[PDB]
Enzyme design. Structure first.
Site, short mmCIF file in Angstrom:
data_model
loop_
_atom_site.label_atom_id
_atom_site.label_comp_id
_atom_site.label_asym_id
_atom_site.label_seq_id
_atom_site.Cartn_x
_atom_site.Cartn_y
_atom_site.Cartn_z
N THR C 81 6.46 -2.00 1.47
CA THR C 81 5.09 -1.69 1.86
C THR C 81 4.62 -2.60 2.99
O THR C 81 3.99 -2.14 3.95
CB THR C 81 4.17 -1.82 0.64
OG1 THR C 81 4.63 -0.96 -0.41
CG2 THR C 81 2.74 -1.43 1.01
N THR C 82 4.90 -3.90 2.88
CA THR C 82 4.49 -4.85 3.90
C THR C 82 5.55 -5.07 4.96
O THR C 82 5.21 -5.43 6.10
CB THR C 82 4.14 -6.20 3.25
OG1 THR C 82 5.26 -6.69 2.52
CG2 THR C 82 2.95 -6.05 2.32
N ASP C 386 8.48 1.53 -11.89
CA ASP C 386 9.00 0.65 -10.84
C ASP C 386 10.52 0.52 -10.94
O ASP C 386 11.23 0.60 -9.93
CB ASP C 386 8.34 -0.72 -10.95
CG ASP C 386 8.73 -1.65 -9.82
OD1 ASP C 386 9.44 -1.20 -8.89
OD2 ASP C 386 8.32 -2.83 -9.84
#
Lengths: 534, 132, 518
Positions: C81-82, C386
């Protein structure tokens, strides 16, 4: 590199702002630490002024503008829901830890290194706490230790004069509810009441319950000895014809006759009540009869009860009736027709207290009420609030001590001993690396804030007191003996907390240390401040 | 049924408490009626009142979201009043404002709606509100 | 209104850099915390990259596009995501001087970025190492990384097995030259949703090779176990039917009201006979089913389920193959959902069940999760989601790449070496991409409190002269071997991150002006 309607802190500006906010909060709550601390004055703007010293109440009521200060206060407030005390300790520890961390960061120490050092020092402090505590005995004759604990708790919140009044009250109230048995402790068994137009020192302890509503007839006895408690849910007020009727007349005499005729319904129930009173210890010596009568009572019925030496109340709260069901042991009678002696309870002296604005009734002196009441008395709102807060804090402290037998001497001995133990063990071990020594030293120095703040509040010089305490500890270590050395805020020299009678709760210290370390780590790891949603 | 409204209505100040007050009703055959009381036993209409300023971002975003809701929530009343015509001295600092009425009473007072969901509010943020 | 010249490109690059710099410190276990301040008095110290990118408001359109890309990747891929935003911002910053100082046209930069994307994918494939996707031990060990050190650390042992079993049930390992490689067609969002069953323990959880239905028998006198099940799906309800236009019922005598019931019985009997013509064992109707219809279907020796949501039928058609027909009269014999396992309704934890599993590979399953409390169930559901995302990433390509920035450093070194031999104006953007790849190791070094220059230089020298498995240690902060310390990341995540970051950089570079329009 910015957006409109937003503001952000870059480089180390966020760290500086957080440190400044923490220092400001610490200075706000620095002066109220310890029995020698001061009180804060809060104004709500509506004309109500609160004079409070407890950290939790001050943080909750006071408005905080700095977001970092808001976060610190909210994090420290968790102490109230866990241990009930230590909020000021948490704030001071966070402030000093952040001061030391900022000082080291100015030297080039990365925040993560400081956080790791703080975690290592926290583990070492937990080990020291485990090794340093004292196990309390389970003897039922520990009333002296409970008195000492109550005195220690109260001296922080009161002016040292009401301590003599509140200490025995709190000790007895907590001990009565929790007998010398496993069972369990529930502070809900201790009722808190407030009365006005009375001196602050009038605060007393009541073994049983106190009823708000009093008698309404001059002929009722002021005191009843060994009274049988009767709880009646049937209204004794004037009753009308069970079927459709009315009062149509040309003169009030017919209405009076109709009312007299209709009064027979209440008269019949009154006859049964009087018969019950007469049958059960009607004339036996050292016996009485008291009726609660949750519902209302007609004045004629009140006079009838009074003429029979019966003390009858009326219009009582349902909660009071439920409490009386256990305090006195009597049952509530739904129907007078089924009334029987088994409904009657038993209680000691029943006394009615007359006040200019109200009248109270005492139903104390019960065989096994499984409850007690504390009457807070004062002439001013702030005095009543302070007394109530002190009583609640003492009750919670004594309950924590009873439930958790782990006891740690106070008077600042624990903090200084922990600081010395850390400075020694962490430096001798060096289990992670040398770079963590900065954070280790910062944590060790920050843990010394509490005794320094206490000495500063007491008016003595912290340097001399700390030096004397360290000298005594060094002498004890050289003598190869176990000794607890604390701070005497009244004389200024060192003292033994186990002899003077100053103790601190294991849970309070554990939670305060953990919360302070967590808050310091969270704040020191803040790299920048972001604004959004505008 | 009834498919009562279907669109956002403009409000002038003189009729604010007529169009909003009129939340306190149902209609014939939508509830029980009784002796000397023709009011429905059930509740009234959910009214979403938008206090807008044309110059503000969220006001423009919501005009879109409110009409889009109105097109599907036929049974829900949506109205708009220039904020400056609703409240004497309406402050820009509260702008935009949404007040939700029901059965003539106030249910929500959402202020600076830019924080009520994403800054770039989607119908997903507004439909999550309308079901609360 | 209008922006011309290099100003628009500068604005876009500055917006991208501003977006990237915020999360620059969100990588690694030593990630720093951030303060989010709302216009009100509330604030949080969350350090979650997704939260930071979600709660941050950006006015520049390029920043909004970057945030949307990151949000989309948060669901498309289980990680990165980052990483995507940081890599794209670093690439844009490195390419900025060429567009501004070197007067390089955007087209050349875009082409060079695409070529560098291809080269980086090739290098990632080269440096990746294989894994045993068939041995359960290796998969459990790999997936334990995303399960341990969490709320589900207590049940990790069984959590890994449950997640792997679910993924394998939905995983289809096929390879041939006729239909190609399906890529395992793993779908977790739709056909792997976890069913929370109160009671029991995590070790009692089981994976159902099919769809689990919570609809109980609509009538007590109905079969609860069929060894040769067959599912038929219908939409039209089995009850009294009116005309297409306005229908009015006029009855003169009170006893004549039974005519409506007789008509309903006739129509329902006809529809039930039509349904039974296909030899069904279970009849599922989306709309309501009358009691008469239930009785008629029971007379035929089959079960009935009414008012079943379309969500159940969508998965039933996948695990049973039953075809849904809107009109009963149009039902065909071929619509019967044969090859169904069982209709067992064994109750677990005082809850109703209906198992439609089988020994086939319908690329769909259901997870029967058990737990001692609702909070435990929800936390286990999130952790299982997850873990299954991580397992899907691992299994989609039986290989993994070293973590700790080793892959990025190796990619940078190889890209520089290849660019040295291109002999063209495009060489500059290749070097820019190679330098920007160093962002991850720089972030790791900074978060670890080490030297941002000396450590990076040592790592680069080790990669150039030694192996590509050297990276930054999360705790020590020194340069160590990732393989020895067990630091790894799935190759799929790295490939997707690089591809998405480079594509986003190219797309942003394409935009050379923002104009008003409605």
């Amino acid at each position: 590199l910015l957006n409109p309607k937003a503001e952000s802190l870059r480089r180390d500006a966020a760290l500086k702002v957080n440190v400044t906010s923490a220092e400001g909060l610490q200075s706000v709550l620095e002066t109220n630490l310890g029995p020698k601390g001061t009180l804060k004055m809060l104004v709500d703007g509506a004309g109500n002024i609160k004079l409070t010293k407890d950290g939790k109440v001050l943080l909750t009521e006071m408005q905080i503008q700095s977001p970092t200060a808001v976060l610190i206060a909210r994090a420290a407030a968790a102490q109230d829901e866990i241990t009930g005390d230590g909020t000021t300790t948490v704030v001071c520890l966070v402030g000093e830890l952040l001061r030391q961390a900022h000082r080291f960061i100015q030297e080039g120490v990365h925040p993560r290194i400081i956080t790791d050092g703080f975690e290592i020092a926290r583990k070492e402090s937990m080990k020291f706490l485990d090794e340093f505590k004292i196990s309390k005995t389970n003897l039922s004759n520990d009333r002296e230790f409970l008195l000492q604990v109550a005195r220690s708790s109260l001296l922080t919140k009161v002016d040292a004069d009401l301590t003599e009044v509140l200490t025995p009250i709190v000790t007895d109230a907590v001990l009565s509810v929790y007998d010398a048995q496993a069972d369990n402790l529930d502070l809900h068994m201790v009722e808190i009441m407030q009365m006005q137009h009375l001196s602050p020192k009038d605060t007393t302890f009541i073994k049983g319950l106190v009823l708000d509503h009093g008698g309404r007839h001059p002929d009722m006895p002021t005191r009843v000895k060994n009274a049988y408690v009767l709880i009646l849910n049937v209204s004794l007020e004037y009753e009308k014809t069970e079927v459709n009727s009315g009062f149509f007349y040309s003169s009030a005499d017919q209405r009076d006759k109709l009312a007299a005729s209709e009064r027979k319904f209440v008269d019949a129930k009154l006859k049964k009540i009087i018969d019950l009173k007469n049958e059960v210890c009607g004339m036996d010596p050292d016996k009485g009869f008291v009726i609660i009568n949750q519902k209302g009572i007609d004045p004629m019925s009140l006079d009838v009860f009074a003429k029979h030496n019966i003390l009858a109340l009326r219009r009582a709260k349902r909660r009071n009736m439920e409490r009386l069901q256990l305090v006195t042991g009597g049952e509530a009678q739904n129907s007078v027709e089924d009334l029987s002696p088994q409904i009657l309870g038993f209680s000691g002296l029943v006394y009615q207290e007359t006040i200019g604005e109200e009248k109270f009734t005492y139903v104390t002196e019960n065989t096994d009420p499984k409850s007690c009441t504390i009457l807070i008395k004062g002439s001013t709102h702030y005095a009543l609030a302070q007394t109530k807060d002190a009583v609640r804090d003492g009750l919670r402290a004594v309950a924590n001590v009873l439930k958790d037998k782990n006891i740690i001497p106070g008077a600042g001995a624990f903090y200084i001993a922990l600081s010395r133990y850390l400075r020694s063990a962490n430096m001798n071990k060096l289990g992670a690396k040398g770079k963590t020594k900065t954070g280790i030293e910062a944590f060790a120095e920050a843990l010394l804030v509490i005794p320094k703040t206490l000495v500063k509040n007491s008016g003595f010089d912290p340097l001399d007191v700390l030096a004397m305490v360290e000298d005594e500890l060094d002498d004890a270590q050289d003598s190869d003996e176990t000794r607890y050395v604390g701070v005497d805020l009244n004389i200024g020299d060192s003292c033994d907390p186990t002899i003077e009678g100053i103790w601190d709760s294991y849970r309070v210290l554990r939670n305060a240390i953990t919360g302070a370390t967590g808050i310091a780590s969270n704040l020191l790891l803040c790299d920048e401040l972001l604004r959004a949603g505008r | 049924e009834r498919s009562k409204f279907g669109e956002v209505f403009h409000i002038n100040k003189p009729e604010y408490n007529k169009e909003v007050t009129l939340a306190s009703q149902g209609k014939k055959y939508e509830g029980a009626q009784t002796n000397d009381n023709g009011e429905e036993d059930d509740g009234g209409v959910y009214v979403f009142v938008h206090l807008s300023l044309q110059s503000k971002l969220q006001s423009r975003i919501l005009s879109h979201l409110f009409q889009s809701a109105a097109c599907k929530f036929r049974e829900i009343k949506f109205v708009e009043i220039p904020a400056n015509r609703a409240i004497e001295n309406y402050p820009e600092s509260n702008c935009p404002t949404l007040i939700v009425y029901y059965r003539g009473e106030v249910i929500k007072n959402m202020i600076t709606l830019l924080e009520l969901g994403g800054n770039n509010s989607k119908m997903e943020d507004f439909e999550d509100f309308m079901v609360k | 209104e209008r922006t011309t010249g290099r100003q628009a490109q500068i604005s876009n690059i500055t917006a991208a850099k501003a977006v990237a710099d915020v999360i620059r410190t969100c990588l690694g276990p030593k990630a720093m915390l951030k303060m989010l301040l709302d216009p009100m008095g509330g604030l949080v110290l969350t350090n979650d990259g997704h939260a930071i990118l979600r709660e941050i408001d950006v006015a520049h359109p390029a920043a909004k596009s970057m945030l949307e890309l990151s949000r989309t990747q948060d669901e498309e891929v289980g990680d990165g995501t980052t990483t995507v935003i940081i890599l794209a911002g670093e690439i844009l910053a490195q390419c900025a001087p060429y567009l501004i100082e070197k007067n390089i046209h955007p087209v050349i930069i875009i082409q060079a970025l695409k070529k560098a994307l291809t080269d980086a994918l090739e290098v990632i494939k080269q440096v990746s190492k294989p894994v045993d996707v068939e041995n359960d031990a290796a998969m459990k060990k790999l997936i334990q990384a995303s399960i341990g050190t969490k709320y589900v650390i207590h049940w990790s042992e069984k959590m890994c097995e449950l997640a792997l079993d679910a993924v394998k049930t939905v995983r289809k390992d096929l390879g041939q030259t006729v239909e190609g490689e399906p890529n395992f067609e793993i779908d977790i969002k739709r056909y792997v949703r976890v069913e929370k069953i109160p009671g029991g323990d995590v070790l009692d959880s089981r994976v159902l090779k099919g769809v689990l239905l919570n609809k109980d028998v609509v009538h007590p006198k109905m079969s609860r176990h069929i060894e040769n099940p067959r599912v038929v799906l219908l939409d039209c309800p089995l009850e009294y039917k009116k005309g297409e236009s306005q229908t009015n019922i006029e009855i003169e005598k009170e006893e004549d009201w039974n005519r409506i019931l007789q008509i309903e019985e006739e129509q329902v009997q006809l529809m039930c006979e039509q349904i039974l013509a296909v030899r069904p064992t279970l009849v599922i109707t989306e709309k309501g089913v009358s009691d008469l219809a239930q009785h008629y279907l029971l007379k035929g020796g089959c079960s009935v389920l009414r008012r079943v949501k379309k969500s159940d039928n969508n998965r039933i058609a996948r695990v049973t193959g039953a075809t849904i027909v809107n009109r009963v009269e149009d039902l065909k014999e071929s619509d019967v959902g044969t090859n169904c396992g069982l209709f067992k309704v064994e109750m677990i934890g005082d809850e109703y069940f209906s198992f439609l599993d089988n020994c086939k590979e319908p690329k769909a399953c259901t997870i029967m999760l058990r737990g001692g409390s609702k909070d435990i169930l929800n936390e286990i559901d999130r952790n299982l989601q997850d873990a299954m995302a991580v397992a899907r990433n691992v299994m989609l390509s039986p290989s993994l790449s070293p973590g700790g920035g080793a892959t990025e450093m190796a990619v940078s070194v190889k890209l520089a070496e290849k660019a040295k031999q291109l002999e063209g104006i495009q060489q500059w953007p290749y070097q820019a991409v190679a330098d920007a790849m160093e962002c991850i190791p720089r972030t790791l070094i900074q978060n670890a409190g080490g030297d941002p220059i000396r450590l990076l230089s040592q790592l680069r020298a080790k990669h150039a002269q030694g192996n590509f498995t050297t990276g930054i240690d999360g705790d020590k902060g020194k340069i160590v071997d990732m393989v020895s310390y067990g630091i790894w990341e799935p190759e799929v995540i790295k490939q997707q991150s690089v591809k998405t970051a480079i594509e986003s950089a190219c797309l942003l570079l394409r935009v050379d002006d923002i104009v008003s329009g409605v």
